[PDB]
């Protein structure tokens, strides 16, 4: 069959790697989510500035 | 231990680590692309600010 010690060590190592990789993915994902929210707000404010600017320009003519 | 159990857990942990690694590399890649776009956009914005203030100051 297998080597008991070897698969135990691989098991512990895979659990450690999965904890590290999970934390890294949850952190990168969280930063991505914050960036998406900030994206929404900035796009709203930009749209507002575009509308003000075009109202000014159109009402100049 | 239980040989079958730790073999199954090892296979499952390897699959989970592949999925989680792929997810982290994809999310990280999107973050990096967003950082590059951040740099370029900040450059262009700075340029527009400078043009605008030059116009306003010369008024």
């Amino acid at each position: 069959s297998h080597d008991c010690a070897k698969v135990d060590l691989e098991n512990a190592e895979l659990r450690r790697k999965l904890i590290r990789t999970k934390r890294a993915f949850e952190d990168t994902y969280e930063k991505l989510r914050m960036a998406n929210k900030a994206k929404a707000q900035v796009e709203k404010d930009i749209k507002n500035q575009i509308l003000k600017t075009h109202n000014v320009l159109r009402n100049v003519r | 231990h239980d040989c079958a159990k730790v073999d199954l857990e090892n296979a499952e942990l390897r699959r989970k680590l592949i999925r989680t690694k792929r997810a982290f590399e994809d999310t990280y890649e999107k973050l990096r692309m967003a950082n590059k776009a951040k740099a370029q956009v900040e450059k262009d914005i700075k340029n527009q600010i400078l043009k605008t203030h030059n116009v306003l100051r010369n008024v």
Binding site: D45, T53, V56, V60 | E42, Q48, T52, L56, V59
Partner: peptide
């Protein structure tokens, strides 16, 4: 219906707020 000096003022105010807004994008 605005005279030239008024147009200048309105454009200037819009431009000033746009400068401030872009600057706020850098933050």
């Amino acid at each position: 219906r605005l005279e030239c000096i008024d147009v200048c003022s309105v454009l200037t105010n819009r431009l000033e707020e746009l400068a401030g807004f872009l600057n706020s994008l850098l933050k």
